[PDB]
Symmetry: D2
């Protein structure tokens, strides 16, 4: 079972992917870990990639796509969940052609749907408990609203994290994710639009339902 997952920052995408990967014993493959395996491990592709990174340039798609496929072959032989790549349409189509050339089949593509204003507010609304950072509090998510100014689980003090309040940075990542010309939504839709012809199932998850409700609908449509 091979799955691609898409969703913006603010959509709970890591949480949902973790649940799927545990249930189906999948390798969870994330674009950052691919580079550490190849750039850090000095594979022939990684030594080639690292000459771009070390000038401040990006790695070209003709090196990145073979890296991804090498990792999928190596870590994903009993099934994989690919998270965070592709980000744009050129990458999505190069990835699809590379997977076909190696006979590697996509079985599911999952997209978590959330309006961009909702996604941004969910990130900025997070409040961290001083006593235990695991305690979920979010001023913009009714089911886990704080108890006034304090933690709804234990009554500890709450604070905001500066990176969650950095609106210029949140907006530049959502700019790319929500770009339906050639950004990540256009990439997700390129897969949606060929699912029926290519024999895979495209699953749309409504990101506004609860952690439990989303997990139920998802684990039902893969089962």
């Amino acid at each position: 079972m091979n799955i691609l997952i898409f969703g913006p920052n603010g959509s709970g995408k890591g949480t949902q992917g973790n649940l799927v990967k545990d249930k189906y014993s999948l390798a969870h493959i994330e674009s950052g870990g691919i580079f550490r395996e190849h750039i850090g491990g000095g594979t022939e592709l990684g030594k080639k990639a690292k000459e771009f990174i070390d000038r401040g340039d990006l790695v070209p798609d003709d090196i990145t796509i073979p890296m991804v496929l090498e990792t999928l072959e190596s870590k994903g032989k009993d099934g994989w969940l690919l998270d965070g790549f592709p980000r744009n349409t050129v990458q999505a189509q190069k990835l699809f052609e590379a997977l076909q050339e190696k006979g590697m089949k996509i079985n599911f593509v999952i997209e978590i749907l959330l309006p961009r204003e909702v996604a941004k507010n969910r990130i900025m609304g997070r409040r961290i408990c001083k006593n235990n950072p695991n305690h979920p509090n979010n001023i913009f998510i009714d089911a886990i609203k704080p108890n006034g100014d304090v933690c709804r689980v234990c009554g500890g003090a709450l604070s905001a994290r500066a990176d969650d309040q950095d609106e210029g940075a949140i907006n530049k990542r959502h700019d790319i994710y929500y770009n339906t010309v050639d950004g990540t939504l256009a990439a997700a839709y390129y897969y949606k639009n060929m699912a029926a012809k290519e024999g895979f199932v495209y699953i749309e998850l409504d990101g506004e339902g609860s952690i439990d409700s989303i997990k139920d609908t998802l684990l039902a449509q893969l089962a």
Copy 2:
């Protein structure tokens, strides 16, 4: 059902208390919220307390204990869980005499047990995920160890929180908690030692078992 809960920082005490209060529909009463009700709301006891606080002195026990009892009467009429008070033996005995004078019965006292070195390491070992602060990671808790330097749920970057690394502050709170002469353990033991005579049950939870395992044993011994 009236319950007192004790445990050091690093023992998961808020999490466990929240579970108990939800299961039994208890008011969760924490020492900080008592002051906001009385100091903030200008009760006669609160206006009296606030003259000490405003000089930098502590509120005397002859004002704090009546505050606690007024809150228990007011917010806790259908059952309460009192968390974070008493902290020492003088408070514990004044509280017991005040509860007897008002005919308010203790039904359970819960103590979460953890060695102090274990408690400190659990606090300092916490690592927060950049992508989602809910994702539990802890270098000192094997079941939720990170995946190398990254989040074990989603592969996001991890960082430490400065307050979790502040060893002088952690040690001064554990100094008080673990003081068996007249600190919080001596207070917990004052209750343990009269449980049989006073007709309440003293529950000891081994804080090194999992969130699930502790919750099972606890919810079993209250049931």
Copy 3:
């Protein structure tokens, strides 16, 4: 030369004290360091203090005042600057009587004056540069306003610190500082009111002028 300095959080008090202590080769004695010398070093007074702290009670004034005087005798024999003690009128008068009993003379008392709303806004207005935390930026201090959303020195990204945004905590410290019944301003005024009789000079610094301008007027009135 012996000096007491008073000022609220938000008044630049540490900066000014450091300048005075360097110019006059004074020991800078701060209430926190007194405890580490005595509580940490197990002086007879410190072992006595630590039994209160370890129950969660404050150290009584009849132990704290002798501690302060022992430190002044020991670290301050060639002149001292005492910062952060006394905080209330009872401490201020006990300190004055203890200094007289040991023949230790006050030469100057410095008070940095700022309206409380100004002090709070100066704390909340601080913005820290990502590239270098030394670069001063403050949305509420015109001379060091940021350059739009970025550092006015180097153009780096700016963020806020959670403790600078914690209005409940800022307000509880200003509650004590600005309490003119028996809090820290009442303590400062107790000294002001006896300066002429006791042969010391009381210096009032207008905390709204620049770091340079305040330093000039101050170093002039001590010279």
Copy 4:
């Protein structure tokens, strides 16, 4: 007077540039602000750049170099200090040819020199004072070492910032800066090597001397 400045993270580069720009009334032009002027202001080059950024690709040098020159013409007509661009040799040579085509002369190039291990330790050694974040403390810089665990200016508590402790991120920026094949040092040296032929002066600042000492030698060699 037109100046290019180079230095790694950890070298005090913003501080020194600010001093030069104030003394000579220069526009301080930093690579981040160029994009906000063009990408944010929708110049014809900026609308072109933003189509790459919105796919997650970099802006090509044939768009970035004209952007830089347009900003230099517009904001830098009475003299500029260009900070943070170029980062590699291809950019450095394209920039030089673009400046020649517009008749814009370089007068000085400043390089702040520090060994990479020294630069990393200066970043990781920073400690921020709780009372005032302006107070410089650094465990790796002897002149501003803390006073034990506390602020050397005011005795306040010290903490570390997570981004200053992120060694993978520090190393990836130093990887590019210290790359003498085609990274930022190779770019700086491309200018050094033509200074005499092109009639500009290349200034090397020893980054291990004090803020004052560096500023003196620098302001002397520009004067």
